[PDB]
Design a binder for this molecule. Structure first.
Ligand SMILES: CC(C)=CCC/C(C)=C\CC/C(C)=C/CSP(=O)(O)OP(=O)(O)O
Ligand SMILES: CC(C)=CCC/C(C)=C\CC/C(C)=C/CSP(=O)(O)OP(=O)(O)O
Ligand SMILES: [Mg+2]
Ligand SMILES: [Mg+2]
Ligand SMILES: [Mg+2]
Ligand SMILES: [Mg+2]
Ligand SMILES: [Mg+2]
Ligand SMILES: [Mg+2]
Lengths: 275, 275
C-alpha cells in the first residue's frame, strides 16, 4: 500500500489498543500524529510478542533482527508498520537508542523475574515505558529534547506504575508480580495474601505508597508542559491526566483490582479542560 | 496424654504425610524411631504453616516464639507434638541450630522469590531439607555426626531437588517456581513455555540437568552409609533410594509433571534389597 494507507493501518492499531492514547494523539498536527501512530505500532508489536506470543524469545529475536535491518536502511518489505516507520524516521530526527532500549525491556519479561526494590521497579518501568516517551520526544518537542527529557522519563514511570497498580490481578493470573517484594515485607502483605486476592488494609497501604510515587512523577512531568510547543501541550497533558485518572478510579472502586477504566465521559472532560 | 500417646500422635502425622519416610523410619529401634517421629512432626508443622496456612507470617512467627519458649525449658502445653519433642530433646543430644535454620528456610517462602542460579537453589534446599537431615543426625548416628554431616546435607539437596522436579506443575499452580532462571535461559525454556505447561526437548534437557545433580548428591550420600551404625543403614539408605526412585518414575512417565508416585510394590522392593 501507499504511505497514507500504511499510516492508516497504524491508526487502527492505536485506536483498537488505547482509547486514551489514540484520543490524545489525534489532537496533534498531521505529520506529527502519523509519526506517533507508527512509533506506537512498533512498541505495540514488541510488547505483544512478549505478552501474547507463543514463543516470545524466538519471535522477539526476529523482531530485533528486522529492526537492525531497518536501521541499516536495507529492510525491503510490504509490512505497513515498517513502511510507516520508515517515513517517520526519514521525516523527523528519531533516535534509534530508545527503540533498542525498549527491546531490552521486553527481554526482561521473557523469563521469571522478581521485583525486589523500588529501584528494580523503576529500572523495568524505564525500559518498557520511559523509552516510549523518549522515542516520541523528537516529534513532540523538536529542538527541546534535553530540557523535557527528565519529565518524559518520569511520565513513563508514572504511567507504567499506574498500569501495574490497575493490573495486579490480571498479572497475577499470568504468573507475573511487579509489586516490589521489599514493599510487601514492609507492609506485611504476604505472597499468600496476594494469592488469595486479599484487599486488606496492608494491601491498601502498599497500593497507596506506589500510587503516591506515580502521582509525584505525574506532577513532575506536568511541570515541564510549558516547555513543549503549543501543539503538543494538550496531547501530552491530556494523555498524562487521563492515564493518571486510572488511580482515582481504582480508589473510588475500593481498590478492587482482582477482577478498572476511566469512563469515556471522564476522558472527554479531561480533554476539554486541557483545551 | 502420656508420652506413649504423644509419640503415637506423631506416628500418625508421618504415616499420613509420607509412605516413604514412615516406612523407612519404622525400621529404626524403638526410641530412635519415636524421636524421629517427633522431629518430623516439628518440620511438618512449620512447612504446613507456610505452604497451607491462611496468614503464614503471623502463624510462623508464633511457631518460632513457641520454639524459643520450648528451648528455654519453659513451654507448658498439652500439645502432643511438643510433649513428644520434649522427650526427644531430653533423651538424645539434639542440636537446636538446624531447627532454627529450618524456620529461616520456611521464611523464604513467605514472599515472592526467584531462584536465579543453582547456588540460589542449593541455599533454599539447605534451609528446608538439609536441616531436617541435620536435626536427625544425633539420633541416627550418635558420636559420628561430623563424619556423616556432609552426606546428610547432600541427601537434603538430593531429596529437595527431587521434590521440586516432581512438583513443577503443582508449584506453578501455586505461583511458585524453583527452577533456576539461569537454567531456563541456558536451555531456552521461557516463562511462556512453562506457563503453557510444555514438555519439549528444552524442558527435558533442563529437567535432566537438575536430575543428574540430584543423582550425584544421592550417590555422595549413599557413600557415607557404612559410617552409620548398623541399625540406621537400612532406614537411611532405604529412605534415600525410595525417594531417588521418584526421578526414574518421572522419566518413565515421559516427564509429564504438569498433572508421580513410586508404587507401593516398588517401595517394598527397595526396602527388601536394603535389608
Ligand atoms: C506522550 C508522552 C511524552 C509519553 C506517553 C507514552 C509512555 C511514556 C508510556 C506508554 C505506557 C503504557 C503503560 C502503554 C500500555 S502497554 P500494556 O497495557 O500492555 O502494559 P504492560 O505490557 O502490562 O506493561
Ligand atoms: C534420613 C536422612 C539423613 C534425611 C531425610 C530427611 C531430609 C534430609 C529431607 C526431607 C525432604 C522432603 C522433600 C520432605 C517433603 S516436605 P513437601 O513434600 O511439602 O516439600 P515442599 O514444601 O514442596 O518443598
Ligand atoms: Mg502488555
Ligand atoms: Mg508488557
Ligand atoms: Mg499491564
Ligand atoms: Mg510443603
Ligand atoms: Mg515447603
Ligand atoms: Mg513440593
Amino acid at each position: 500500500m501507499d504511505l497514507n494507507n500504511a499510516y492508516d493501518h497504524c491508526k487502527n492499531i492505536i485506536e483498537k489498543h488505547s482509547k486514551t492514547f489514540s484520543k490524545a494523539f489525534a489532537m496533534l498536527p498531521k505529520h506529527q500524529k502519523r509519526a506517533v501512530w507508527a512509533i506506537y505500532a512498533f512498541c505495540r508489536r514488541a510488547d505483544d510478542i512478549v505478552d501474547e506470543g507463543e514463543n516470545p524469545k524466538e519471535e522477539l529475536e526476529a523482531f530485533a533482527v528486522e529492526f537492525d535491518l531497518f536501521m541499516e536502511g536495507r529492510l525491503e518489505t510490504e509490512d505497513p508498520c515498517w513502511i510507516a516507520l520508515q517515513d517517520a524516521f526519514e521525516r523527523f530526527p528519531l533516535d534509534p537508542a530508545p527503540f533498542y532500549e525498549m527491546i531490552v525491556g521486553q527481554r526482561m519479561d521473557l523469563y521469571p523475574k522478581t521485583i525486589d526494590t523500588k529501584d528494580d521497579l523503576l529500572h523495568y518501568c524505564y525500559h518498557v515505558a520511559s523509552t516510549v516517551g523518549l522515542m516520541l520526544l523528537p516529534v513532540l518537542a523538536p529542538g527541546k529534547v534535553s530540557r523535557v527529557k527528565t519529565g518524559a522519563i518520569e511520565l513513563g514511570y508514572a504511567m507504567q506504575i499506574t498500569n501495574i497498580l490497575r493490573d495486579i490481578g490480571e498479572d497475577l493470573d499470568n504468573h507475573r508480580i511487579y509489586i516490589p517484594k521489599q514493599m510487601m515485607i514492609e507492609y506485611g502483605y504476604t505472597r499468600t495474601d496476594l494469592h488469595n486476592k486479599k484487599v486488606n488494609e496492608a494491601f491498601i497501604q502498599l497500593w497507596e505508597d506506589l500510587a503516591q510515587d506515580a502521582e509525584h512523577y505525574y506532577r513532575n512531568a506536568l511541570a515541564t508542559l510549558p516547555e513543549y510547543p503549543v501543539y503538543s501541550r494538550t496531547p501530552v497533558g491530556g494523555a498524562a491526566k487521563m492515564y493518571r485518572a486510572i488511580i482515582q478510579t481504582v480508589r473510588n472502586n475500593d481498590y478492587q483490582v482482582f477482577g478498572n477504566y476511566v469512563s469515556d465521559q471522564m476522558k472527554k472532560q479531561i480533554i476539554a479542560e486541557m483545551q
